[PDB]
Ligand binder design. Structure first.
Ligand SMILES: [Zn+2]
Lengths: 126, 454, 121, 171, 74, 134, 102
RNA sequence: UUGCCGUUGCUAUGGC
C-alpha cells in the first residue's frame, strides 16, 4: 500500500502513466494506492488548472485515508504516518520529501522517472 | 461462462489437432507391429485377463456350513492359503506364532499341524539395522504369504524382517531385513503362478523379491502414508493403497511407473444431491484392496465405503457408502457422568458422533464375479459385481463371525459349472495394526470358515 | 449447546486429522490429556483437539477453560479412535496438541487449520 | 541469472544477510538466481492479470501457472487465484530447496548440518541420492526425503572413521 | 639427488597479509556474520526469545520507572 | 492444373498447435491417469540437472522404446549433440523449476490464433452456425 | 546375488535365434559381470553357453538395474557364423588381427 | 476345535 502525493500525481499525468497499472508493473505486485485527505486538499487548492489531476485522483481504484490534524501539509502528514507504522511505500517526487523518506529507515520510495515508476528502498523487486 | 469457454476451446483444440468409415482402412505401421506381435513369444504372464468367471447369482448363499474354529492365540492377524494346479493354510498372530493348517478335508473344520513361535529369544544382540539377520520374530508378525508353488511361506511384521519358512517343516530358510529403522512390512502378495513377492513397507516403500533366488528385485517408491495394503495377479502389475493419502496406486513394476487414483467424495455436494428431494459424509483413509481382474479393482475405505475402480478412470466408477453399518453410539451410562438422562442425552448431540464401521478386510476372488467384505459388524458380506462391470450389489451375509475380520480369502473346489468354496476369515478381537477397538461384543480369536456350495 | 460444543463436521475433521498425522510424524504433536494440559500451561501449543465421545466428557472438558485463559484454539473431533489412529499410536487418544515450532515443515498447513477452527470458534 | 538494479543499497545488503544466514546460502548467486526466475514468473502473472476475464490466454495459462506452482509447492492447494502468484516471493521459493527441507524435517540440526549431509550424500529423495543443496523438492517428493540406505545414518555399514577407531580399539 | 622445489616457489604467494580462516569459506563467513547480526539485533530492538521458560524469576536485568520506550503519535 | 504428391500435406504434423497450457488442461480434465514415475527415478544427475520435464520424459520413453525395438544404442553424434544437448540443458536450467517448465510464461505466442478458433469449421454462414449448433 | 529378467522375447528363424531385452538387477553389487551373466542366461535358457550373447549394457544412475540386449542361439557353429567378429573376439574364440601399416 | 478357565457334546457355545 502506497501513499501518493501531489507532485507524484502531476508527474504521472505528465509522463502518461496510469496510477495502479504503473504501480503494478513497477513492483510486479498488487498495489493499493492511498490519497490522504491532505494530499487531496492540496490537489483541490492547486486550482482549476489541475482539474485533470484532481479527477484522476478521484478514482474508485485509489482508496483514501482520513488524516486527523489541522492544516493541509501533506509532507508532514506522510512523514508522520510512515514513521509511525513502517507498512507503507511512499510515492513522491519532492526532493525534500524524498530526502526525508530515504533518511528514515525501512521505508521504500517510489518516484516517476523516465516513462515508468521506479522504486528504491524495497529490496525485493525482482 | 468461463468453464463453458474452457470446454469449448478445448474441443476446438482437439479438433484442430485431429486436423493436423471407408472400405479400405489399413495402416502400415499398425499392421507391421501386428506382424511383430505374431512373431513374438510369451503369451503367458501378460494376459490382460477380463472377468471370465461369471457366477455371482449362480451359487447358493444363505445356507453355508459355517464353522468358527476358535483357536488359542491372541489377535490373529493374517491368513495365507494354497492350491496346486492336499491344501494347506497358514495363520499368524500377535503372539508371534505362525501356525500351519490342513484345509483340504473340505466338509469339516481345519486341522492344526505345526507351530512356529518366535519370542523374546530372537531380539538381536546389536540394535543395528543391517545385522537384523536372526532366525525368528521378536515383534508383531503382521502378514503371511504362501508361495503359488507351495515350497515356502514368507512372513513378516513390525520387526522389519522377511523370514521365509519352508512348507514341509516350518523352518526359517532365509532372513532378509528391510535395512532401515521404520521398515515395518504391512502387506505381502505373490504375483500369481510365480516366485515373486511384493511387500509393502511403511517407509512409503514397496519392496519386491524373488524368493527361490533369495534376491530383491526392485524397490519402488511413491505413496504418501504407510502402504497399508497390496494386491497382485498373474501380470507384473501391482496395486497398492496407502492409508491416509486417500489414493490407490497401481505399478508397472518393470517400467517403475504408476497410475494414481484419488478418492473425492464430499458431503457438501452429496447432501445437495440428497437435498434435491441422510447420514453420509467424506472419507477417512483408504485401507484394503484386491485386484479383481487386470482392468478393475476394489478398495475398502475407513468410512465404510467399498469402491470399484477401473484402469481407465481416475475417479471411481462405483461407490457403496455404508457397507457394514454404523457403530452403536456410546451409552448414556458411559458418556457424561451427570445424573439425569436429559443431560446425558444432550451429550450425544443427536446423530453427529455416530461413526461407521470401517471395512478391515476385502477379498476379490481373482477374475470372478464376487467379492467378500469383513469388519466387526459380526456379519461378513458377499457382493457380486454386475456383468457390465459398472456396479456391484449385496448378495447375502455370512453371520457366524463375531469379531474383527483381519483377513478374508477363499478356497476353491468343484469343476467349471458346479463349484463349492470355503471362505476363510481370520477373526480377532483387535485390529491388525493397533488396538483402537472398544466394545468387544462377544468376539473370539478364531478362524471363521464357511462352506458355500453350487 | 452441548458441553463438547465446537464440534467439527466431516471435511474439517479430516483436514484436522491429516495435519495431526503429519505433526505426529514431525514430532510436533503432544498426545494425551495431561500432556496436552502440560504443554498448554507451558504455552507451547498452537491448537488442541479434544475428542467428543470418550467415556466421561468432563475428563477433557477441563481443557477448554485453559485454552480460553491463554487464547488457544480448541476443536472437537467426533472420534477418539480415529484421533488415536491419526496420532499414530496403538490406542485411542482423547486429546492432543500441536506444539509451536518455526523450524517446522508444516507451518502453513497448521496455520490454515488454525484459521478454519478459529472461524468455527 | 542477473544482478539487481541497485545492488548495493543497505536494505538489499541486510536482506541478503538475513536470507543467506537463515537459509545457509554460500553467496549472493543463490538469491539472485531464484529471484531472477521468480521475477520472470510474476512478471508473466502480471500480464495475465492485465488481460481480462474469459481471455483464452488468461484462462489456460492462468490455471496452468497456478497448478504447476502448486506442484512445485510454493503455493498451497486452496489459494487457486492468480493474485497469490503476485504475493509470492523469494523465500517462499528457497524454503523449497533440499537443505531447508532436510533441516525442517529434522534429519539435521541446522541448515549447515543439512548442507554437509547433502554434499556428503547421506540424503536421498525417493530412489536417487541427491547431492546438491539447492534442489527445489516438490510436493510429492516432500515426504520421501530420508537418509540414504548406503549411509551410516541410514542403516548401512559405518564409515571409515568409525571402522578405523573400532579396529584400533580392537588392537 | 633431486633438488625438489618447495611450497613458496611452487605456489608463489609472495608477501601476503595475515588472512582469515572464516574468509577461507564463503559459507562459514555468512554463518558468522549473521550470528553477529542477530546478536546485535538484541541490542537495538527487544527480541521475542520464545516466551516464559520456567518459573517467572523476574526481570533479571532491571526495571526503569522513568523510561517509556513507546512510539507517540504525531 | 495438375496434382503433385505432397507429403507435407499428408504428413502428421500435430506440433504447430501443441500448446502446453491446453495440454495441461487436458491432463487435468482427462479422467484417466497419467503414468508418473516412482518419485526418485526421474531426477537426473543426483540433482545436478533438474528433475526432468514432461517433454523430456516423453522423449526419453520414445528413445528407449525405439532402443529396445531395434536393438541399437544411440550415439554421441557431435553436431547434433553440441546443438541439442547443451542448448537443451541450458534452457532446462533456465526455465525448468522443480520438474515444471515456466519458459512458456516468458514467451510471446498467441494461443487462440494458431491452436484455438477452428479454421475448417469456421461456420461463415448464419445457416451453417445454426446447423452446427442444432 | 544377481537377478535376471527377460522381456519381449521374439524368435528370428532367418538368423536361427531368439532375442530379448535383459533387465539385470544387482542391488549392492557393482555391475552386470557379463560372463557370469552369460552363465546365468545359459542356465535359465537351454545349455548353448557359447551360443548365448549379450551386448548392449546401460546401467541406470545409482546402480541396481542395467538394460542389455540378449540374443541366444541354438547351434554354436551357426552362432559363430551369425555373430560379428568383434563380439567373437570379446567373448568366444575368434582372434584375427588387422595388418598394422600406414 | 486352544492359552486358560465355564457350560461341556458322548458337538457347539461365552467370559477373561
Ligand atoms: Zn493528512
Amino acid at each position: 500500500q502506497v501513499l501518493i502525493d501531489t507532485n507524484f500525481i502531476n508527474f504521472s499525468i505528465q509522463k502518461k502513466v496510469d496510477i495502479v497499472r504503473g504501480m503494478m508493473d513497477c513492483l510486479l505486485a498488487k498495489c493499493n494506492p492511498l490519497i490522504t485527505d491532505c494530499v487531496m486538499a492540496e490537489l483541490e487548492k492547486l486550482g482549476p488548472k489541475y482539474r485533470i489531476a484532481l479527477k484522476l485522483a478521484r478514482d474508485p481504484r485509489i482508496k483514501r485515508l482520513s488524516c486527523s490534524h489541522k492544516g493541509t501539509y501533506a509532507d508532514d502528514c506522510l512523514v508522520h504516518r510512515v514513521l509511525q507504522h513502517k507498512c507503507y511505500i511512499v510515492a513522491t517526487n519532492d526532493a525534500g520529501l524524498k530526502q526525508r523518506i530515504r533518511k528514515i529507515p525501512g521505508i521504500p520510495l517510489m518516484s516517476v522517472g523516465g516513462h515508468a515508476y521506479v522504486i528504491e528502498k524495497l529490496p525485493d523487486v525482482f | 461462462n468461463p468453464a463453458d469457454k474452457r470446454r469449448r476451446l478445448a474441443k476446438q483444440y482437439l479438433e484442430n489437432l485431429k486436423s493436423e468409415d471407408e472400405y479400405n482402412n489399413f495402416d502400415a505401421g499398425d499392421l507391421d507391429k501386428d506382424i511383430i506381435a505374431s512373431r513374438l513369444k510369451e503369451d503367458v504372464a501378460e494376459q490382460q485377463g477380463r472377468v471370465f468367471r461369471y457366477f455371482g447369482d449362480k451359487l447358493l448363499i444363505s445356507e453355508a456350513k459355517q464353522s468358527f474354529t476358535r483357536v488359542g492365540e491372541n489377535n490373529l492377524t493374517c491368513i495365507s492359503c494354497f492350491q496346486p494346479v492336499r491344501l494347506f493354510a497358514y495363520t499368524v498372530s500377535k503372539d508371534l506364532q505362525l501356525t500351519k493348517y490342513d484345509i483340504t478335508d473340505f466338509s469339516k473344520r481345519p486341522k492344526k499341524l505345526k507351530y512356529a513361535k518366535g519370542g523374546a529369544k530372537y531380539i538381536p544382540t546389536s540394535k543395528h539395522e543391517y545385522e537384523n539377520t536372526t532366525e525368528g520374530h521378536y515383534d508383531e508378525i503382521l502378514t503371511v504369504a504362501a508361495s503359488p508353488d507351495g515350497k515356502y511361506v514368507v512372513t513378516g511384521g513390525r520387526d522389519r524382517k522377511l523370514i521365509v519358512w519352508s512348507t514341509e517343516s516350518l523352518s526359517p530358510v532365509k532372513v532378509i531385513p528391510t535395512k532401515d529403522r521404520r521398515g515395518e512390512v504391512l502387506s505381502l502378495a505373490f504375483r500369481k503362478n510365480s516366485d515373486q513377492l511384493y511387500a509393502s513397507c511403511a517407509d512409503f516403500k514397496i519392496r519386491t523379491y524373488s524368493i527361490n533366488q533369495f534376491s530383491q528385485l526392485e524397490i519402488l517408491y511413491g505413496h504418501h502414508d504407510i502402504v497399508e495394503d497390496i494386491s497382485a495377479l498373474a501380470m507384473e502389475r501391482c496395486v497398492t493403497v496407502g492409508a491416509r493419502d486417500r489414493t490407490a496406486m497401481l505399478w508397472k513394476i518393470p517400467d517403475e511407473t504408476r497410475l494414481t487414483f484419488r478418492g473425492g467424495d464430499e458431503p457438501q455436494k452429496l447432501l445437495r444431491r440428497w437435498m434435491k428431494e441422510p447420514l453420509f459424509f467424506c472419507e477417512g483413509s483408504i485401507d484394503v484392496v484386491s485386484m479383481v481382474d487386470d482392468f478393475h479393482f476394489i478398495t475398502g475405505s475407513d468410512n465404510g465405503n467399498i469402491c470399484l475402480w477401473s484402469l481407465a478412470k481416475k475417479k471411481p466408477i462405483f461407490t457403496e457408502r455404508i457397507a457394514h453399518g454404523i457403530l452403536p453410539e456410546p451409552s448414556f451410562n458411559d458418556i457424561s457422568g451427570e445424573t439425569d438422562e436429559e443431560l446425558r442425552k444432550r451429550q450425544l448431540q443427536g446423530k453427529k458422533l455416530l461413526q461407521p464401521f470401517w471395512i478391515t478386510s476385502l477379498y476379490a476372488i481373482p477374475y470372478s464375479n464376487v467379492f467378500i467384505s469383513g469388519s466387526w459388524s459380526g456379519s461378513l458380506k458377499v457382493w457380486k459385481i454386475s456383468d457390465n462391470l459398472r456396479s456391484f450389489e449385496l448378495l447375502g451375509e455370512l453371520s457366524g463371525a463375531k469379531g474383527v475380520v483381519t483377513k478374508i480369502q477363499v478356497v476353491e473346489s468343484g469343476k467349471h459349472g458346479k463349484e463349492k468354496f470355503r471362505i476363510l476369515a481370520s477373526i480377532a478381537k483387535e485390529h491388525r495394526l493397533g488396538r483402537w477397538i472398544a466394545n468387544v461384543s462377544g468376539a473370539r480369536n478364531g478362524i471363521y470358515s464357511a462352506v458355500i456350495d453350487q | 449447546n452441548p458441553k463438547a460444543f465446537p464440534l467439527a463436521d466431516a471435511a474439517l475433521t479430516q483436514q484436522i486429522l491429516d495435519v495431526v498425522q503429519q505433526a505426529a510424524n514431525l514430532r510436533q504433536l503432544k498426545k494425551g490429556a495431561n500432556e496436552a494440559t502440560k504443554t498448554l500451561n507451558r504455552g507451547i501449543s498452537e491448537f488442541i483437539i479434544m475428542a467428543a465421545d470418550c467415556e466421561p466428557i468432563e475428563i477433557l472438558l477441563h481443557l477448554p477453560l485453559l485454552c480460553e485463559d491463554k487464547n488457544v484454539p480448541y476443536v472437537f473431533v467426533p472420534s477418539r479412535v480415529a484421533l488415536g489412529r491419526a496420532c499414530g499410536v496403538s490406542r485411542p487418544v482423547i486429546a492432543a496438541s500441536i506444539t509451536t515450532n518455526d523450524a517446522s515443515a508444516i507451518k502453513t498447513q497448521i496455520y490454515a487449520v488454525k484459521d478454519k477452527i478459529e472461524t468455527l470458534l | 541469472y542477473s544482478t539487481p538494479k541497485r545492488p548495493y543499497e543497505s536494505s538489499r545488503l541486510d536482506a541478503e544477510l538475513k536470507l543467506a544466514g537463515e537459509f545457509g546460502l554460500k553467496n549472493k548467486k543463490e538469491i539472485y538466481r531464484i529471484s531472477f526466475q521468480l521475477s520472470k514468473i510474476r512478471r508473466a502473472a502480471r500480464d495475465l492479470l492485465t488481460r481480462d476475464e474469459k481471455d483464452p490466454k488468461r484462462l489456460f495459462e492462468g490455471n496452468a501457472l497456478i497448478r504447476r506452482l502448486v506442484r512445485v509447492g510454493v503455493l498451497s492447494e486452496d489459494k487457486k487465484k492468480l493474485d497469490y502468484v503476485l504475493a509470492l516471493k523469494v523465500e517462499d521459493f528457497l524454503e523449497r530447496r533440499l537443505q531447508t527441507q532436510v533441516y525442517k524435517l529434522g534429519l539435521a540440526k541446522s541448515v549447515h548440518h543439512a548442507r554437509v549431509l547433502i554434499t556428503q550424500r547421506h540424503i536421498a529423495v525417493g530412489k536417487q541420492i541427491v547431492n546438491i543443496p539447492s534442489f527445489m523438492v516438490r510436493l510429492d517428493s516432500e515426504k520421501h526425503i530420508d537418509f540414504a540406505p548406503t549411509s551410516p545414518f541410514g542403516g548401512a555399514r559405518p564409515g571409515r572413521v568409525a571402522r578405523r577407531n573400532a579396529a584400533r580399539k580392537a588392537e | 639427488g633431486k633438488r625438489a622445489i618447495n611450497y613458496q616457489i611452487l605456489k608463489n604467494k609472495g608477501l601476503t597479509p595475515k588472512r582469515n580462516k572464516d574468509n577461507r569459506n564463503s559459507r562459514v563467513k555468512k554463518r558468522k556474520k549473521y550470528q553477529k547480526a542477530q546478536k546485535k539485533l538484541k541490542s537495538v530492538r527487544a527480541v521475542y526469545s520464545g516466551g516464559q521458560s520456567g518459573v517467572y524469576e523476574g526481570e533479571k536485568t532491571g526495571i526503569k520507572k522513568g523510561l517509556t520506550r513507546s512510539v507517540k503519535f504525531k | 492444373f495438375e496434382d503433385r504428391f505432397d507429403a507435407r500435406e499428408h504428413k502428421d504434423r500435430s506440433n504447430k498447435s501443441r500448446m502446453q497450457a491446453m495440454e495441461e488442461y487436458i491432463r487435468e480434465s482427462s479422467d484417466q491417469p497419467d503414468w508418473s514415475a516412482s518419485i526418485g527415478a526421474d531426477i537426473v544427475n543426483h540433482g545436478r540437472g533438474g528433475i526432468k520435464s514432461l517433454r523430456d520424459t516423453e522423449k526419453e520413453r520414445r528413445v528407449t522404446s525405439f532402443e529396445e525395438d531395434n536393438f541399437t544404442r544411440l550415439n554421441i553424434t557431435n553436431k547434433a549433440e553440441k546443438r541439442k544437448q547443451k542448448q537443451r540443458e541450458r534452457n532446462a536450467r533456465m526455465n525448468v523449476i522443480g520438474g515444471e517448465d515456466f519458459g512458456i510464461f516468458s514467451s510471446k505466442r498467441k494461443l487462440e490464433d494458431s491452436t484455438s478458433r477452428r479454421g475448417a469449421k469456421k461456420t461463415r454462414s448464419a445457416w451453417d452456425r445454426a446447423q452446427r449448433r442444432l | 546375488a544377481v537377478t535376471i529378467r527377460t522381456r519381449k522375447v521374439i524368435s528370428n528363424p532367418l538368423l536361427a535365434r531368439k532375442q530379448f531385452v535383459v533387465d539385470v538387477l544387482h542391488p549392492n553389487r557393482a555391475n552386470v559381470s557379463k560372463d557370469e551373466l552369460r552363465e546365468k542366461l545359459a542356465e535359465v535358457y537351454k545349455a548353448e553357453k557359447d551360443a548365448v550373447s549379450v551386448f548392449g549394457f546401460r546401467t541406470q544412475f545409482g546402480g541396481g538395474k542395467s538394460v542389455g540386449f540378449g540374443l541366444v542361439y541354438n547351434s554354436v557353429a551357426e552362432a559363430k557364423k551369425f555373430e560379428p567378429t568383434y563380439r567373437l573376439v570379446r567373448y568366444g574364440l575368434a582372434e584375427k588381427v588387422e595388418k598394422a601399416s600406414r
